[PDB]
Amino acid sequence: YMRQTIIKVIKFALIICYTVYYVHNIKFDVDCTVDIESLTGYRTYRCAHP
Amino acid sequence: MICLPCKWVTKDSCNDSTGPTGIKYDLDRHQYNYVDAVCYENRLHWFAKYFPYLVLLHTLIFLACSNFWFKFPRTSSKLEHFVSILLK
Amino acid sequence: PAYRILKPWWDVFTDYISIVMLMIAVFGGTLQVTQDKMICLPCKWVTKDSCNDSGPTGIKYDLDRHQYNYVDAVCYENRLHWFAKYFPYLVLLHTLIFLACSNFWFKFPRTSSKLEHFVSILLKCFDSPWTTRALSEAKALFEKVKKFRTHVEEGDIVYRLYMRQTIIKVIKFALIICYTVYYVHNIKFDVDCTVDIESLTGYRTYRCAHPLATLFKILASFYISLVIFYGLICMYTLWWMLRRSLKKYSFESIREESSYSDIPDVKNDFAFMLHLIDQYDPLYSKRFAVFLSEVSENKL
Amino acid sequence: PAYRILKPWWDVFTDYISIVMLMIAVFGGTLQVTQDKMICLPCKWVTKDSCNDSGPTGIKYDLDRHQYNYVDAVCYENRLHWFAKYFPYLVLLHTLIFLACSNFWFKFPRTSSKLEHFVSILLKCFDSPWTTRALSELDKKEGEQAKALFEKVKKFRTHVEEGDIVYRLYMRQTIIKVIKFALIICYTVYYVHNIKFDVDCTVDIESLTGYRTYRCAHPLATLFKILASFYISLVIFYGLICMYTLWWMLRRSLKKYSFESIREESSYSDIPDVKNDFAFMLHLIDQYDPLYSKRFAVFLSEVSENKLRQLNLNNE
Amino acid sequence: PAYRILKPWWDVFTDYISIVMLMIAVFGGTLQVTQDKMICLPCKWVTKDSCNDSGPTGIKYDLDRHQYNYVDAVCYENRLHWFAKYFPYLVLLHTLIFLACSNFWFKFPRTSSKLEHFVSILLKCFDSPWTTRALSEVLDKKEGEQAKALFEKVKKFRTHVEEGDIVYRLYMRQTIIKVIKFALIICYTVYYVHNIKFDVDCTVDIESLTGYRTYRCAHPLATLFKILASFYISLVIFYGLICMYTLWWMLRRSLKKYSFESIREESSYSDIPDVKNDFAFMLHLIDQYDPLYSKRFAVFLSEVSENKLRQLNLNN
Amino acid sequence: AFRVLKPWWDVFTDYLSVAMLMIGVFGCTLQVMQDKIICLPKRVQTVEMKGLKTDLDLQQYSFINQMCYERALHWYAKYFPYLVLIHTLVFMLCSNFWFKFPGSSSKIEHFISILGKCFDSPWTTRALSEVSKKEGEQAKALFEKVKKFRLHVEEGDILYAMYVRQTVLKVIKFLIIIAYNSALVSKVQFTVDCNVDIQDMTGYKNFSCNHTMAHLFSKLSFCYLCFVSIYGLTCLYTLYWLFYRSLREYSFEYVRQETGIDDIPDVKNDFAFMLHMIDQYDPLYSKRFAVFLSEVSENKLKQLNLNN
Ligand SMILES: CCCCCCCC/C=C\CCCCCCCC(=O)OC[C@H](COP(=O)(O)OCCN)OC(=O)CCCCCCC/C=C/CCCCCCCC
Ligand SMILES: CCCCCCCC/C=C\CCCCCCCC(=O)OC[C@H](COP(=O)(O)OCCN)OC(=O)CCCCCCC/C=C/CCCCCCCC
């Protein structure tokens, strides 16, 4: 029971740290530059993530 | 990811420079789908793509940690003995 | 359930009619959610805001696909009749209220407690061995029966709630039939929409086809038929609760048939649920008579 | 459940047939919801309001996708036969009527009460050990349960012979099922050929599209024909079962059951020849298992009651 | 349910195989309902009703989306083989018929009554407290009465079931049907599994509506409907082999004659006769499941054990 | 009781198999999606750029998509979840392979019945008190039962060898799965160069495609590989524990060290194997069941019953 509690609390710490750090990268507007000009004709696109 | 190309570019960036008329990109529907798939795979952040699966993995590990002592035989035998004789 | 006997043939028949009404309501609801739409096409030629129709070659409209979707959405919102759009939700609401009216006689804790007490004592009398001996010719059970009689003859709340439920279930039937019959002719396949989106589309008037109208027609007709059945059942139910007085029950036939003639005339809520018992099967009432007569108590 | 004892082989066969037709009704309704569209292409050259049917390059119709959808909806509504559109709904309604007619036996409160009482007394006679002990030819609790059970059986026998409501109800149910089988077979056999893959529609929407006659393909028409053939086969089997059930009711008087073989086998030779509804439910018992009537018949003869009371006097 | 005892290892193996076949049938039916189609592209160069096949730029066919949909529907109806279209429905029907053959034993009312009564008395004998004492070789009044009633019920049930064999006949017929249908399924599925092709050359003569005569079509789910079919065939083979073994188990030994020499020689009760017919068949089924049930039941039918039970009852 | 004879590694492998089955089902539902691969032809005919017109219909694009899905996408990237389902089904079937055998089940049930009834025997506590009436007759009967068990189980060695066979099957299946999955996991790529010859149908011959769920299938394959690796590590530890100590020989000398009576013998074969099972479960069960093996203990208990 002790070990389960420490494992759960350290995993909570890791989860909250990485989720709070990376939660701001979910954006509606994404600028992509993927170098597919040979197949499409344009290089940079402005995508919307619904 | 609904992707629309930037008609005018300036140093790998969109330039953003009598009635109004729509911009003609001359792209097929399938070229649009190809662009959507490519930019979704490449330039969307990994967190946005794999947030629900990471959440599911974290919750499964949490449930396994909360129910490990119920399934581990060395502790489960003691627990069932305690519960049975205490209830009865 | 526990009240498998307090529900007569009209109650169970209306319950099954309510179940079939509910499933057609759910089917219509998923019908309206999933693929319900309307395909709208303008009249190209015009004569006083109409279309004239002065080998064959297709008519070009110069409309984008999104302009067509906009015309569809605007005409669906504005010029499709609200009955053709919210018929399944109205049916679902009506059936939910019908089921609530049917089960409020079960769910109210005072009436639920009274019904469970009567059901428990009736079942334990039905499985009791002494009633067979009495009919051929338990003291604590007899005292419990007397105490329950004194408890339950005080008020007639159960009969009053049943009466109120019957009145709601018949007046709601009347309103449902009136409004559904009056508005069932507004579900048309072909409609005309004049929504004034000329600044966005270029056309004023459109002819729209509602693909699920005819189904929503016949289902509604089907629904009407079911409602009629419900009402007819409820109609006779009103007769069953107006021809005879259910607050007073006479044990005359049973006390004449049985050796004991001292069974009193039961009144109030006891009389009402014993009338329900007699409607279901007279064996239970005939058997509970001998657990009430004080002469048989003296023999017990 | 407890009514499984009263259902002979025809009833359970019809129940499984009915659940199968419900499965095909649900499948047909789901497919009619999801993919019951049709693809309509205009006839480029119209001859006498018809289609002339007269390197290669594709034909240009100058029609938008939305004009095509409008043509599809209009011709699906107008020129597709009503059977091809409402076959699964009709099948569902027919199967629901079959289920209601088969289960109205168990839902009508008078007949349901009689049937439940019969099942209860038969099951408690099965559980009674004294019933087996008497047939093999004293415990206090066994004696109490026995005396209660014989008094129960006399009371039930006096109760149930009054009216043959259950037998008449079964007759009406079988008659309703067979006439509905006849009507279903007639109209479905007549109208199954109208489900066609290729149809021609003429809906007069030249004002909105520009073409008068169209040739339409119904992709679900062949699958609906297969489902209709399956439904016809299932209804034929159900109807044959109904013919056998009606012939079973009309072969011998089910309101007259003789225990002559049973009382001839047993030592008790005074089991009365019961009649009416009790005879009917006992005939159904014989259709399920003759052992139930075999072990229940000892509760009706007066000699068995005489020896029961003699053994009670010996015990008391 | 209660009939888990009567199902040997082959029966539960075929139950799992039928469940798996139903699972792949549901998967194939879902794919067929949702995304079964074909993408048909016209052949610009035609030669003897076939495609000639004589920077780069695309080929303009001048066909609308709806002309393409019409071509797809017509060449799916007319030129794609019926096996590729209706394989999920065929496997669903075959699995349903196999399950019906398996459970018709449990649903037929006469055999259902026989099996239920046999299972009930076998379960109450297996849990009878007197069996432990009898195998270990005073009696409680309730326990003694229960033991006496159980002995008499076993005797009368043996006399009741020994008269005729209807359970064995139904099992024989079900195994024969299950192997015959397996042979037919394997034959026709093996013959028609080669018609599931990814590339189909369709020629439907809709030149008046489209402008082209021959089209080449891709059936996207063909390859999947190939491998699943192969998987299905594999399962059927397993099923058939199991059924074949069961058929051999019916024929290598007489299933209507059971000898208690494995028990009456070991136990002191050597007076046990040889039961026959249906009783022998269900006892052999128990021996297939677990010989312990038959061993513990075998003491309740010999008369020496009856004598010693009556002696113990008298001693109380 | 079939839970008691299952050590921690067996429950761990069962839960890993359940997770692998869930992964396979998720992959199959991923394969349900209609839109699978998206293809565009190659070499098609403030700087302002303009789109490249391929002059293709939607049906031509769909035909190219299906042609490249059938003849250019790797078979692993299309049929990975079905292989996962098959492998996890075989893993689940072989998990209880030594459980389902008839003789194995009979001896396991006899052992657990004898051990459980010994565990609620008062005379076990009586003998533990002695070391550190009617129940005497019950203990004598249970001693004859233990002797019957010794005559019924120890003559064979089916259980240990069959368990070794099942563990070896698990180990080799893990090896094969890891091998071909590591060999073919690189085939699940996003960008695929499709080179079908449909030039007579669409006008183009070379196409560049993307598998839309290539990243998700790669993640699923890596998760399945991690699950199979954990399964293999567990089975390798099981093999090490099985072979490092001879489960045909259980030395009761550890009981002899603290308990004074030395008459209990060293069991062999199936008895020793199942006693090692119960030692992995709970060593108190074995240290308590040890006292029922001696003959001079039976003589004492016989002496006690004689005095009573
Ligand atoms: C009160 C009810 C509450 C429950 C409602 C829950 C909503 C349903 C949940 C599932 C969501 C999926 C719906 C997706 C809709 C959008 C997809 C789309 O664009 O579909 C296009 C297309 C529109 O055209 P077609 O239907 O071809 O028109 C042919 C004309 N006859 O629609 C489809 O292809 C169907 C879309 C998915 C439908 C799945 C859900 C339908 C449920 C069926 C209900 C009946 C089931 C049992 C039938 C009973 C027997 C009568
Ligand atoms: C025995 C026969 C039983 C038949 C029962 C069938 C049940 C389903 C019947 C209803 C059909 C509903 C039609 C829905 C069509 C809606 C529009 C359409 O064509 O959808 C295509 C669209 C394409 O995918 P997107 O998510 O856009 O992919 C790109 C973005 N990621 O979605 C689809 O693939 C189909 C849409 C839902 C249809 C399927 C619904 C039920 C699926 C069940 C899954 C079965 C998995 C079984 C798991 C284990 C397998 C071993």
Task: Decide: helix, strand or coil at residue B12.
Answer: coil
Picking from E312, E293, E301, E306, the residue whose alpha carbon sits closest to that of residue E264 is E301
Is-contact D62 C60, C-beta < 8 A? Answer: yes
Please tell me which residue of chain E has the smallest CA distance to D214: E209
For CA atoms D134, D140, D145, D146, give the dihedral sign. Answer: positive
Residue nearest atom 43 of ligand 1, based on CA coordinates: D30
DSSP label at residue D44: S
What's the Cα-to-Cα distance from E260 to each of D28, E5, E154, E283, E293, rounded to whole Å? 56, 20, 16, 10, 13
CA distance E8 to E18: 15
First CA to last CA distance, chain D: 40
- Ligand 1 near C69 CB (within 6 A): no
Copy the structure tokens of residue E151: 């002995």
Q: Which residues of D277-301 are buried (b: 16+ CB within 10 A; e: fewer)?
A: bbbbbbbbbebbbebbbbbbbbbbb
CA distance C278 to C282: 5
Picking from D43, D300, D256, D277, the residue whose alpha carbon sits closest to that of residue D155 is D300
CA distance E33 to F125: 68
Is-contact B79 B70, C-beta < 8 A? Answer: yes
* Angle, CA F45 vertex, CA F40 and CA F46 arms, to 5°: 95
CA distance C34 to C38: 13
Picking from F114, F91, F89, F109, the residue whose alpha carbon sits closest to that of residue F159 is F109
Residue nearest atom 46 of ligand 1, based on CA coordinates: D30
Copy the structure tokens of residue E171: 């099992």
| Cα D220 to averaged position of ligand 1 atoms, centre (Å) | 16
CA distance F42 to F39: 10
Query: How close does chain D come to E252, measured CA to CA in Å?
Result: 32
Length of chain A: 50
Q: What are phi and psi of B16, to 5 degrees?
A: 55, 50
| Cα B17 to averaged position of ligand 2 atoms, centre (Å) | 44
DSSP label at residue C204: S
DSSP label at residue B25: -
Copy the structure tokens of residue B11: 């140093």
| Cα E221 to averaged position of ligand 2 atoms, centre (Å) | 13
For CA atoms D54, D59, D62, D63, give the dihedral sign. Answer: positive
Picking from D213, D224, D219, D225, the residue whose alpha carbon sits closest to that of residue D198 is D219
Residue E214 CB coordination number (10 Å): 23
Which helix (H) or strand (E) covers residue F37, if one does?
strand F37-41
Give how far the C-alpha of residue E140 lies from the chain's centroid of Cα atoms, to the nearest Å: 46
D35 Cα nearest atom in ligand 1: 27
- Ligand 2 near E86 CB (within 6 A): no
Is-contact F271 F131, C-beta < 8 A? Answer: no
CA distance F191 to F198: 20
Copy the structure tokens of residue C104: 């409020």
Residue B39 forms contact with A (CB below 8 Å) = yes
The closest CB to that of C58, out of D67, D73, D152, belongs to: D67
Residue F301 CB coordination number (10 Å): 23
User: CB–CB of F208 and A41 under 8 A?
Assistant: no
| Cα E21 to averaged position of ligand 1 atoms, centre (Å) | 27
What's the Cα-to-Cα distance from D201 to each of C57, D77, D217, F272, rounded to whole Å? 17, 10, 10, 84
Residues of chain A with a CB closer than 8 angstroms to some CB in chain B: 1, 4, 7-8, 11, 15, 22-23, 25-27, 30-34, 36, 39-50
- Ligand 2 near F151 CB (within 6 A): no
CB neighbours of F21 closer than 8 A, spacing ≥ 6? F85, F88, F89, F92
Q: What is the DSSP string of D165-208?
A: HHHHHHHHHHHHHHHHHHHHHHHHHHHGGG--SEEEEE---TTT
CA distance E83 to E194: 10
- Site of tokens 């499965």: D23
Q: What is the stated resolution of the deposited model, in angstroms?
A: 3.2
What's the Cα-to-Cα distance from C273 to each of B31, C109, C266, F287, rounded to whole Å? 75, 17, 10, 68
Q: What are phi and psi of C173, to 5 degrees?
A: -60, -45
Kindly tell me the burial class for residue C175, based on how many C-beta atoms sit within 10 Å of its own C-beta (0-12, 13-18, 19 or more). Answer: exposed
Mutation to test the D interface, candidates E115, E209, E213, E216, most D Cβ within 10 Å: E209
User: CB–CB of F58 and B29 under 8 A?
Assistant: yes
Is-contact F213 F30, C-beta < 8 A? Answer: yes
Ligand nearest to the CA of F37: 2
Edge-first strand order for the sheet with A29-33 is A29-33, A44-48, B2-5
Q: Which residues of F181-198 are buried (b: 16+ CB within 10 A; e: fewer)?
A: beebbeebebebebebeb
User: CB–CB of F8 and B31 under 8 A?
Assistant: no
What is the SS3 string spanning chain E? CHHHCCCCHHHHHHHHHHHHHHHHHHHHHHHHHHHCCCEEEECCCECCCCECCCCCCCCCCCCCHHHHHHHHHHHHHHCCCHHHHHHHHHHHHHHHHHHHHHHHHHHCHHHHHHHHHHHHHHHHHHCCHHHHHHHHCCCCHHHHHHHHHHHHHHHHHHHHHCCCCCHHHHHHHHHHHHHHHHHHHHHHHHHHHHHCCCEEEEECCCCCCCCCCEEEEECCCHHHHHHHHHHHHHHHHHHHHHHHHHHHHHHCCCCCECCCHHHHCCCCCCCCCCCEHHHHHHHHHHHHHCHHHHHHHHHHCCHHHHHHHHHHHHHC
CA distance D6 to D123: 12
What's the Cα-to-Cα distance from F232 to each of C289, F8, F95, F176, F241, rounded to whole Å? 76, 15, 13, 11, 14
What's the Cα-to-Cα distance from F228 to each of B74, D229, F19, F214, rounded to whole Å? 25, 50, 10, 21
Task: Decide: helix, strand or coil at residue C216.
Answer: helix
Task: Decide: helix, strand or coil at residue F263.
Answer: coil
Gapped junctions in chain E, after residues (C–N > 2.5 Å): 54, 137
Maximum CA pair distance of chain D? 111
Picking from F192, F183, F170, the residue whose alpha carbon sits closest to that of residue F80 is F183
Task: Decide: helix, strand or coil at residue C137.
Answer: coil
Residue F121 forms contact with A (CB below 8 Å) = no
What's the Cα-to-Cα distance from E231 to each of E11, E186, F207, rounded to whole Å? 21, 12, 33
The closest CB to that of E57, out of F32, F67, F203, belongs to: F203
Mutation to test the F interface, candidates B32, B35, B41, most F Cβ within 10 Å: B41
Which helix (H) or strand (E) covers residue C229, if one does?
helix C213-240
Copy the structure tokens of residue D237: 């089997």
CA distance C146 to C129: 19
What amino acid is encoded at D100 in this protein?
A
Residue nearest atom 51 of ligand 2, based on CA coordinates: F28
User: CB–CB of A37 and F49 under 8 A?
Assistant: yes
What's the Cα-to-Cα distance from F3 to each of D90, F51, F111, rounded to whole Å? 53, 66, 13
CA distance F135 to F118: 12
> What is the phi-psi region of residue F251: left when phi exceeds 0, alpha when psi lies from -120 to 50, beta otherwise?
beta
- Ligand 2 near F30 CB (within 6 A): no
CB neighbours of E210 closer than 8 A, spacing ≥ 6? D41, D58, D59, E42, E63, E67, E70, E71
CA distance F227 to F13: 10
Q: Please, which experimental method was used? A: cryo-EM
E24 Cα nearest atom in ligand 2: 51
User: CB–CB of B48 and A26 under 8 A?
Assistant: yes
Give how far the C-alpha of residue B81 lies from the chain's centroid of Cα atoms, to the nearest Å: 44
CA distance C268 to C289: 16
Copy the structure tokens of residue D56: 């290669």
- Ligand 2 near F200 CB (within 6 A): no
Is-contact C37 C84, C-beta < 8 A? Answer: no
Residue C116 CB coordination number (10 Å): 14
Is-contact E243 E179, C-beta < 8 A? Answer: yes
Residue F245 CB coordination number (10 Å): 13
CA atoms within 13 A on the CB side of F45: 11
Neighbouring-strand partners of residue D198: D217
Is-contact C44 C51, C-beta < 8 A? Answer: yes
Task: Decide: helix, strand or coil at residue D226.
Answer: helix
Please tell me which residue of chain F has the smallest CA distance to A42: F49
What amino acid is encoded at F101 in this protein?
F
Neighbouring-strand partners of residue F48: B8
Copy the structure tokens of residue F281: 């479960």
DSSP label at residue D36: -
- Site of tokens 């391929």: F54
Copy the structure tokens of residue A48: 């919307």
What's the Cα-to-Cα distance from B67 to each of A1, B61, F105, rounded to whole Å? 10, 10, 29
Is-contact E194 E310, C-beta < 8 A? Answer: no
What's the Cα-to-Cα distance from C67 to each of C36, C130, E108, F128, F197, rounded to whole Å? 19, 82, 63, 91, 39
CA distance D49 to D211: 10
Copy the structure tokens of residue C160: 């009053």
Is-contact D40 D72, C-beta < 8 A? Answer: yes
Is-contact D77 C214, C-beta < 8 A? Answer: yes
- Ligand 1 near D85 CB (within 6 A): no
User: CB–CB of F51 and B74 under 8 A?
Assistant: no
CA distance C98 to C87: 16
Gapped junctions in chain A, after residues (C–N > 2.5 Å): none
What's the Cα-to-Cα distance from E204 to each of D1, D199, E69, rounded to whole Å? 56, 16, 14
Is-contact D91 D22, C-beta < 8 A? Answer: no
Task: Decide: helix, strand or coil at residue B8.
Answer: strand
Do chains A and D have 3 or more beta-carbon pairs under 8 angstroms?
A: no
Is-contact E225 E268, C-beta < 8 A? Answer: no
Copy the structure tokens of residue E17: 């195989």
| Cα E21 to averaged position of ligand 2 atoms, centre (Å) | 20
First CA to last CA distance, chain A: 43
CB neighbours of F230 closer than 8 A, spacing ≥ 6? F16
Please tell me which residue of chain B has the smallest CA distance to A41: B27
